[PDB]
């Protein structure tokens, strides 16, 4: 399969991240893509290509315009206000609050933010557009008839909802790709989020869309970021009822239990009638991944890929989470390999 | 007027405050109570006494039990979790999120938090409790017949809502005082929040209660903390319909304008028929406040006090905001002076 990757991801290099009550160097760092790209290259998938330029039409079909407009200038406004640090939200529209949008930059960032553990820094916007571009190109390859393709996206995007950034995500790539596929002739598309964390952004974007089915395998939100979405009972709403399938799982879940979930989701997706599947690939489910509590081993990522591919429909793998350890590349490369069959 | 002050306020001495993307020394620090207490004693208000011991019965009538339970052990669980910095929420139940409560510390701290600019530190709970004692005691004084009293509360509490902390607040001292007055025999009590910021926590606690009226004057939320509550449109709900009155004002607002809103707020308080008024006093409205944009002069506080006292009903002044310059002590004493007549 072809690999779409943009060097512009490096433009996203924030120096701080709120964690454990401290500002530390962001976990979703640049070296992540370097290794992923290297591990997959040696896996035989060395047909890497840069993405082409794209407008904002596709993304404007899945994200709020005010939200996008906010991102493009957030940093400039932030620095203009005179802040010495990076842009980090402090106040949030939580329970029983007004729906109005603040005019001030300090209020807007909070309004368009679901988690303070992510900071907007110089380049973030341009970086996000490029990662989005990789997703669009990957989607185009599926639309052209390619059986599979991998968009090495960075920054990731499954936590970016309709009008909010966080969880290290700004533009929901997986969602723009799903939208792209539709725009190219698909009537029904499915998104499968295997990343450790619930793809709360993706869920929100398609909760009321009946043309897209969302399935996510993640850690019980009762005790894992994002904490406020991902419960089994969230099955959709209104025009999108029945189109969301969450599979929350407790600590120590092994592939035995995890794989059963994968099986069930694939069933619901098949019953949904998806013409293709956008795979939100996050390899943070690895037993040796710092911020995660599932017990998956590297071999399992080969099973994961093969299994999803066995669906018989075209697949577009989109990069999401997975950090720290040097096995990230290997694990990602194994999912691609399993997909290759 | 009697002055209630506890030394255990010093127990609250956080080391960090997320401001402008950096963790800086908290604005609401111990040096505040020291200055205020010294200024009021120097203005004659030297009959200072420590609060008596009080249970949780009163506070449990304005705050959620779950929330209170959370605060008491928040710091213990945070350190026991392994985090290095202070307890700061990173994830927030924002738009379209589940109403479910997380089980881990990371999830609960966000669930019960409306702003990340406030961290839970060791001793915070005990401090918050003493501060609450000072309000209760001050309340009993009003119930005993005193026409005025001053509860030098710290930490402050007007930003603490039913089940969430923030804005340097954890327990809504003013709210507890109001409840106290009603438990002592009152049937209709009003709370006047002159603090620069909106009393989002207070408004939230009595929003659906008809026995309490809430009037607040504050920097327009469209561009001032907390940003998500305080618009004129917010007048109450259900059983509390019509019992909330917000008076938001723009940048550089001088007393010549601020005072006009005070006269109207007082007028609505009279129409409400309040038997007494708990005045949430924040002096951050001062023209020199490091984080507010109002242009009130030290002398105005004397006018403010005299005007509020002219209400004719008993007044309980509960300390809230006011930062930076030492004039905070002067400004606070000028209100007690204007109230004392
Ligand atoms: K997931
Ligand atoms: K106020
Ligand atoms: Na949907
Ligand atoms: Na009320
Ligand atoms: Zn993840
Ligand atoms: Zn204040």
Curated annotation (Swiss-Prot), chains A, B:
Q: Which cofactor does it need?
A: Zn(2+)
Where do the annotations place substrate binding?
19, 106, 117, 323
Describe regulators of its activity. Answer: Zinc ions inhibit enzyme activity in a dose-dependent manner. Inhibited by KCl at concentrations above 10 mM. Inhibited by o-oxyquinoline in vitro, suggesting that it is a metalloprotein. Inhibited by various substrate N(8)-acetylspermidine analogs bearing different metal-binding groups such as trifluoromethylketone, thiol, or hydroxamate, and by hydroxamate analogs of short-chain acetyldiamines.
Q: Which domain of life is it from?
A: Bacteria
> Which EC numbers characterise this protein's activity in its record?
3.5.1.-, 3.5.1.62, 3.5.1.48
Q: Which residues form the active site?
A: 159 (proton donor/acceptor)
Give the GO terms filed under biological process for this record: epigenetic regulation of gene expression
Q: Which transformation does this protein catalyse, written as a reaction?
A: N-acetylputrescine + H2O = putrescine + acetate; N-acetylcadaverine + H2O = cadaverine + acetate; N(1)-acetylspermine + H2O = spermine + acetate; N(1)-acetylspermidine + H2O = spermidine + acetate
Q: How is the cofactor bound?
A: Binds 1 zinc ion per subunit.
Family stated for the protein in its record = Belongs to the histone deacetylase family.
Please report the name of this protein according to its UniProt entry.
Answer: Acetylpolyamine amidohydrolase
Q: Which organism is it from?
A: Mycoplana ramosa
Q: What is the lineage of its organism?
A: Bacteria, Pseudomonadati, Pseudomonadota, Alphaproteobacteria, Hyphomicrobiales
Q: Which gene encodes it?
A: aphA
């Amino acid at each position: 399969m072809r690999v779409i990757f943009s060097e512009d991801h490096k433009l996203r290099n924030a120096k701080t991240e709120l964690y454990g009550g401290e500002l530390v160097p962001p976990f979703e760092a640049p070296f992540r893509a370097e290794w992923i790209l290297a591990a997959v290259k040696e896996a035989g998938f060395d047909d890497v290509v840069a993405p082409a330029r794209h407008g904002l039409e596709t993304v404007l079909k899945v994200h709020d315009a005010g939200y996008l407009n906010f991102l493009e200038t957030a940093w400039d406004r932030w620095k203009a206000a005179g802040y010495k640090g990076e842009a980090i939200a402090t106040s949030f529209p939580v329970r029983r609050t007004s729906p109005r949008i603040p005019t001030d930059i300090e209020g807007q960032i909070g309004y368009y933010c679901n988690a303070a553990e992510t900071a907007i820094s110089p380049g973030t916007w341009e970086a996000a557009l490029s990662s989005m571009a990789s997703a669009i190109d990957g989607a185009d390859l599926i639309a052209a008839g390619h059986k599979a393709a991998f968009s090495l996206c960075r920054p990731p995007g499954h936590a970016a909802g309709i009008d909010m950034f966080g969880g290290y995500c700004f533009i929901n790539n997986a969602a723009v790709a799903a939208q792209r596929l539709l725009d190219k002739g698909a009537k029904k598309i499915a998104i499968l989020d295997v990343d450790f964390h619930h793809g709360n952004g993706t869920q929100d974007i398609f909760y009321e869309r009946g043309d897209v089915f969302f399935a996510s395998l993640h850690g019980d939100p009762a005790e894992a970021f994002p904490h406020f979405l991902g419960y089994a009972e969230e099955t959709g709403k209104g025009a999108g009822a029945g189109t969301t399938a969450n599979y929350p799982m407790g600590r120590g879940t092994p592939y035995s239990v995890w794989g059963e979930a994968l099986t069930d989701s694939l069933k619901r997706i098949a019953a949904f009638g998806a013409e293709a599947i956008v795979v939100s690939l996050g390899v943070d489910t690895f037993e040796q991944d710092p911020i995660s509590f599932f017990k998956l081993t590297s071999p399992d990522y080969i099973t994961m890929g093969r299994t999803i591919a066995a669906s018989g429909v075209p697949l577009l793998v989109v990069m999401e989470g997975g950090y720290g350890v040097p096995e990230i590349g290997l694990n990602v490369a194994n999912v691609l390999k399993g997909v290759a069959g």
